[model samples]
Target: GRLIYTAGGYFQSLSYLEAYNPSDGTWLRLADLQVPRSGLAGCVVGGLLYAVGGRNTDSSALDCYNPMTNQWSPCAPMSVPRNRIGVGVIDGHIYAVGGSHGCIHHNSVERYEPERDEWHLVAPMLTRRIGVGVAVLNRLLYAVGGFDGTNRLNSAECYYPERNEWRMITAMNTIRSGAGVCVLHNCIYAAGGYDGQDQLNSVERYDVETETWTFVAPMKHRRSALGITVHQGRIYVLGGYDGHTFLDSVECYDPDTDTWSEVTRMTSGRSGVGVAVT
Candidate 1:
C-alpha cells in the first residue's frame, strides 16, 4: 500500500493531499480534505482514515476518508476543540490524546467508537501539552514530547488500557515539540522538531524492554510538525516546517542500519500534516 499524506498549512491552511509509493518512488495527487487545516491529527483504524482537530480557531471537527471510494464523510467531533492533538488506535477504538485548545494546553483524553459513532472521555494525561506524539505499542498508548504552555518537554508517558491509568516513562534527551513519533519493531522513534529555541534535526528511539531512550542519526533537515509513519520496517517522515520556512522535504530512517536518508519530496511545502499507510 502507498502512504497517504493529508492536510497541512504553510502559506495558508491546505486542503492538498498526496500519496507516495516507495516501490515505484512516485507521488500522486489525492482527494483534498474537506477543510483546509494544519496541526491536525490522523490515524487509520478498521481500514478508514480519520482526520481530527486543527488550528485556526481550533476545531473539534472530525472527518473520515474512505480510500476505496476516494471520498470523505463527516464523523463525530471531539468533545473539546483542539490543535496538535496526539492520536492513536487500539482495541478497535480511536484514542485522541492531549493537545492545546486555545491558550491552555490540555491533559484531557477522549476515545471514539466508530461502531457507535460516539465520543467518550477517558483518563487524561498526567501532563498537559500540545504537539505531543502518540503511538500504540504493546497494546498500550504512549504520548511523547510537546510544549506545556511554558516549556518544550522531553517527558514521555504511557497509558495502560487494562489498568485505565497513565504512567511516566523514560524521557528523551532532547526537549521538543511538533515532532513525529511512531513505533517500529517495538521501539518508539521520536524525530525532528522545535527544541523550544531552534528547529531540530535530531532523532531518538525508546526501547520498551529496556525502558530507555537512545540517540540515533539526525535527519538531514531541522523540522517540526512533520508527519511520520512506520511502513515496511522503515520510518517515513513527511513535510514540516523548519522555523524559517515550510518544507516539502521528506526523509526515511532505517532501523536495521540506524541510518537516515532522503526520499521524494512533496509537491508543495507544508507543516502540521497528517500521514497514514493504506
Candidate 2:
C-alpha cells in the first residue's frame, strides 16, 4: 500500500509515474498525463494528482489526473508557463514555485484550488531561479537552489500563505541548479544538482526554526535533475543525468546518520520529471 514516484526528465515521453510498492521497486506506469511533458511541478491532493507548469512540444501547460479511474482533466492553466519548477500541496491548496520559462528564470508563484478549478497569482520570489526544488514544511513553501540563467544558486526562500509573501532564508554552502528536495521531520533536504560546469554530489538541510542550512552527506554520484521523495522515514533520490548521459541509479539518505547508500537502479534513465508521492 506504499507508493513511490519520480519526475522522469525533460523531453521525456512522460513526466510523472507512480510505483505501487517499495518492496519490488518497480514502476506501474499509471495513467499517462494528457500533456505528456516533463520538467514540471506536481502534488497530490485528496488522493488525486495535480500537475502544473510543464514544457510541451511547443510550450508549457497545466493539468491533473486521477489514476484510480485512469482519467485526466485540465485544471486552471498556470499563470505562467515554466519548466523545472517545484510544487507542494498543503491544506487542499497547491503551490507552484519558481522555474525557467524558456530563456528566462521566473520568480512568480501561483496556487491552484481543485474545488474551484482555478489558479490565482501569488507573491513572487525576490530571486529568479529555474530547476529549483520546492517543498512544504510546517505549512510554508520552501524554495531551494537553481539557475538564474546566468549563475547557479545555493540560496533558499520560504513563502508564507497567510501573508501572501516570500521571505529570504539562509543559503546552502554550495551553488547548484537542477536539484531535488523533500522535507522530513520538519527538515528540508536538498540533493543532487548541477553547477554551470559540473554536476554536484552535495546535500544540505534547512532548519525552519533556526532559519539556517546545514551541510549533510553528498549524493553517491554527481548528478542533477533527479527526483526526491521521503517514505518510511528515509529519503530516496532517483535517476538524474550526469551531464553527458541519463542515469538509472537510486540512492537513499538516512538523516540520523547523515549518510547515503545506493539502492536499486531504476529501469529507465531520466531527468526533469515532475515527481509526486501518494
Candidate 3:
C-alpha cells in the first residue's frame, strides 16, 4: 500500500508501531516493539523493518518486523546502547551512527548484517553526536548536524565502508541538533532542528557533486528531533518537539517547487521518532 511506518516515540506507552498510508490519509496501528522505548532508529532493509536502540530501552536491543507476517522478532543487539541514533542503509546493511546513553554521548558506530543476525563495531566518528542526521550520498554515509554532548553542531562528515574511516565534510550555515536528513534528487537535505538557542524552521540542501550547502525553502513550523523520509519523490517531515509542545503536525516539501504544505498527522504527538518508508 506504499505506507510510511513509525515506531516508538516520545511521551507515553509508545511500543505501538503504526503505518500511515498517503493514499487515504489514514494511520493503521500495527505490531508493538517487544521492548518499548522512545528515540529509536527505524530503517527498512531487504523488505524487513528494523527498530534499533532507543531511550529507556536496554540500549542494546535490536528488533526486526516483517510486513508480510506482521510480527516482531528480537535480533542481535548493538555493542553499545544508543538512543537518538542516526541510521541509514547502503549495500543492504544498516549502519547505526552516533547517539547517547543516559549519561554520555557517543561517537562509536556499528553495522548490522541480517544474514548473520549479528552486529559489528565499525570506526567511530571523529566527533561525538547525539540526534545526528544521517543519509547516503555518493555511496558514502554522511552524518550531519547534532549535539556534541555540550553544544549544537553544524559540522558534518561521511564514512567509507571500504576502509572503515570517516572524513570530514563541509559544515552547514547554521548550527543544528536533532535535524532531519534525507537524500532526494541526488542531493542531501537537512531539515528543521534546534540551533542551540531556538527550534529552527530553516532548511538546507547539500550538493554532493560540488560539496556545497545552500539554503532552501523553510518549513512553516520550527521543530527538533523530527522524523523524516522521502516518499513518492517528496520529503515528509513528521512529529517533533517545537520547544513549547510536542507536535503531531506533519509537513511535506516539494524540492521541485521549493515549497512546504501541511499534511495529515499521526494519531499521537512524537518527538525523536523512528520513521521508515515501505
Candidate 4:
C-alpha cells in the first residue's frame, strides 16, 4: 500500500489534501494540514510527516504531522528561510536540499534528526541551485536538475553521509530546471521541467551503480515547477505549470514499458510545491 501528500501554494489558501488509491485510480480527501501554506518540502520519517524550510504567508516555518494522532506540531526551523526546496529523508534524518529564499539561490543543505529534534547544516552543493531534484537511495542523497539564477542546468550530484561531501556524478542530457525526480528500483527517474523559457516533458534516469545517465520515455504532458514521487513501482507526477497556467493533471510512468499516461487529476492546481508518499 502507498499514499501521497501535497501542500498548497503561495497567496492561495489551498490546504486541500487528497490521497490516491493506485489500484483503483481514485483519490480521496484526507485531513487538512493545520496551516495553509505552499512552497513547503515534505518527508516521512518513522511514520511521522515532517515539512520544513518554507514560507507560511511570509517567512521560514517548520512543521511535522502525525497521522495516527492527526496533529500538527512545530519543530526547529531552518537557519534561513527558503522556498520550493527539494527535500527527502535518508536513513533516519530529513535532508533539506537546495532551494531559493526570495532573491538568490541556495546551495546549503540541512539535516533534521527527529530523534534529536534539531537541525544541522551539512555539506553544501557545488552550485547554487534551486528547484533541484532530490531522491534518497542506499542511504545517500542525489540532487538533480535545477536553476542557478543564471540559467537552467542539467547538472547532477550526490551527497555522501559518511564523508559529508557532495560529489559530481552525471549531467542530464536535457538542460532543464524545476523538474520532479524520484527513485525506483535503485534508479533515479527525473521528469517534467522547464528548459529556459518553455515547459518540457523530457525525462531521464541515472543508474546509481553505473553512475551514468540515460534517456527515458518522456511524459505525455509538458510541465515545469512540479512535484514527483515514487509509490509502489510507479512514478507519479503532480501539479505544475505549463507555461501559461498551473495544472491539476496527474500522470504516472512505468519504467518496464517506458511509457506514461494520465492518472487521477489533482484536486488543486499550483506549482512550486513539494510532495511525499508512504
Candidate 5:
C-alpha cells in the first residue's frame, strides 16, 4: 500500500482528486469533491480521509473520501466556514485547527468523530492563526507557523488531549505561512512557505525532546500552501503556490542527508492541496 495526493486549487478552486503510486511512479485521478474548495485541510482517521473546512466563498462543508469505494460522501460540516485551516488526526479523531474565517483569523479548534459523524469544539489556541501547518507527533497535535492578522508568524503551539489544553512551544526561526509540515524520526519538519515579504525555500526542524528548532537545507523551489507527508524515511512536499504562479512541482527531503531533491510534478498546478498516505 502507498499514498494518494488529492484535490487542490488556486483561487478558482478544484474538485478533482488524484492519487500517486510511489511504487510504480504513476498518478491516477480519483473522485471529485462534493463542493470544490481551496485551503481545505485533510487527515486520515479510521481508514478514511476527512476533508475539512475550506472555501470558494468560505464553506463549512465537510466531506470524506474512501479509497476502498473510490467515492466521496458528505460528512458533518464544520461549525464555522474557513479557508487555510490546519488539520490532523490524533487518537482516532480528526482536529480542525485555526484558519481565516473571512477577514477574521481564528484560534478556534474543532474535532470530528467519524463514528458519530459530528464536529465538536475543542480547546482553542493561544493566538489567532491562518494558513497554518498542522501534524501529530508523540500523540500531540502541533500547529506550526501561520499568519496572524497582523503579520506572518514563526510561533508554534501544541495540544495535549489528556488535559484538553494547549501550550506555547519553541518557535521556528523563520516566520512563515502556508508551509508544509510533517513528523519523522521523532522530529518535525517545517518546509517552504511565504514569509511576509517573499516566498521561501528555507526549511527547519523541531526537536521534541529539546523543544528547539534549527535551520535545515532549503528547498529547490520556493513554495506556499503545499502538502507534505513522510514515507519510508523521506519527506515529500507536493503542489503549492510560488507567489507568481500555481505550482505542480514536487520535492523530497532526506533527513539523513539534510538535503532536498526534485521529484515528479503533479498533472496540474495547484495550491492548498489536500494530502494523505494510504
Candidate 6:
C-alpha cells in the first residue's frame, strides 16, 4: 500500500521521520534527516523524498531519503537558505519559493534540477513571503498566503515555467501564514494557519477556472504550521500547534462530501512538519 511520509518539525524537537500506512492506519519510524530542521518543506521527485530548506544551523541543507534502504543522504544545498519556504514540483523540476531567514522575510525564488543536483534563481515573488503555502495545479505552481513582515497576506500568485515569470492570482478571503497547501480536483486548498491575530481552523480553496476562492469545511482543531498531503483521494492534515501546545491529532477531509473527520494521531505532536505522499 502507498504511504504518507513526514519529516522535521518545530525547532528540532521532532526532527525524526515517520511513514503512515493508509491501508492499515499505522505509522512506522524511519531514518531521521542528517540535519535536523524546522519549517522544512518536502516533495517527491524521481520517487525520492527531498527535504528542502528550513530553519536550523544550516538552513540551506537538502536531504534526500531512500525508501529502499531507509537511509538519508545530503543533496546539493540551495543558494539561499530559507526557513518556512514554500515548495512545489512541476515538470520534473522543484521550485522553492519565498521564506525568511534570521527573522528577515525574502521574496527570492529558486528552481532545482535533480538530474544535475543544481539550483538556479527564478523569478522572485512580488513581495516578501514567509510561511507561504505552495502547490501545483495544471502545470502551474501557485503560492498562497503568508506574512509579509508587517502584515499577514491574503494575496496569492502563480509561476509560469514557460516564461520564467510570475503573475498575481485572485486573492484569498482571509489572511493565512504557516498554512498547508495541496491540490485536489484541480483546485488548490490552503488550510488552517494563523491570521497574525490567532490560530485558525478555517479552510479555503481556489478554483482557477472560476478565478475565485471559496470557503470550505473547517478542521476540528484550530492549527497552524501543520503537515498536509493527499492520499487515497483524501486530504490528511497532520499534527500542528494549537496556540497552547503542539498537537498529535489528525484530521482528514473528503472533498466529495465537503467535510472533515478525525483520523488516527501520530505518536507525538508535530508543528511545521514537512509531508509528502507516494
Clashes of each: 0, 6, 0, 0, 0, 0
| Candidate 3 positional error at 2, Å | 1.6
What are the per-residue Cα lDDT tens digits for candidate 5 across 82-154? 7998898888888889988878899999988889998899999988889999989978999999988997899
User: In model 4, what is the error at residue 204, expressed in angstroms?
Assistant: 0.5
Q: Cα deviation in Å at residue 94, candidate 2?
A: 1.0
lDDT of all predictions: 0.87, 0.77, 0.89, 0.79, 0.86, 0.89
- For all predicted structures, in order, the TM-scores are 0.97, 0.92, 0.97, 0.93, 0.97, 0.98
For candidate 4, lDDT tens digit of each residue in 185-221? 9788888888887899888888888988888988888
Question: What's the residue-level lDDT of 27 in candidate 1?
Answer: 82
| Per-residue lDDT of model 2, residues 168-255, tens digit only | 8888877878888899887888887986778988888887778777888788788888877887888888778888877878788888
Instruction: Give the lDDT of residue 208 in candidate 1.
Output: 92
TM value for model 3: 0.97
The C-alpha stretches of model 1 lying farther than 4 A from their native spots are none
Query: Compared with the true structure, what per-residue lDDT tens digits does model 6 show for residues 1-278?
Result: 77899998873545689999988988999998877877989899888998998876538877889888899988888888888888999989889988888767988899899889899998898878999999999899998999899989989999898998889999999999999899998899999999988899999999888999999999999999999999989999998898888999889999999999987898888798899987
Candidate 1 whole-model C-alpha lDDT, 0 to 1: 0.87
TM-score-better candidate, 3 vs 4: 3
Task: Report model 1's TM-score to 2 decimal places.
Answer: 0.97
Worst 10 residues of 3 by lDDT: 52-61
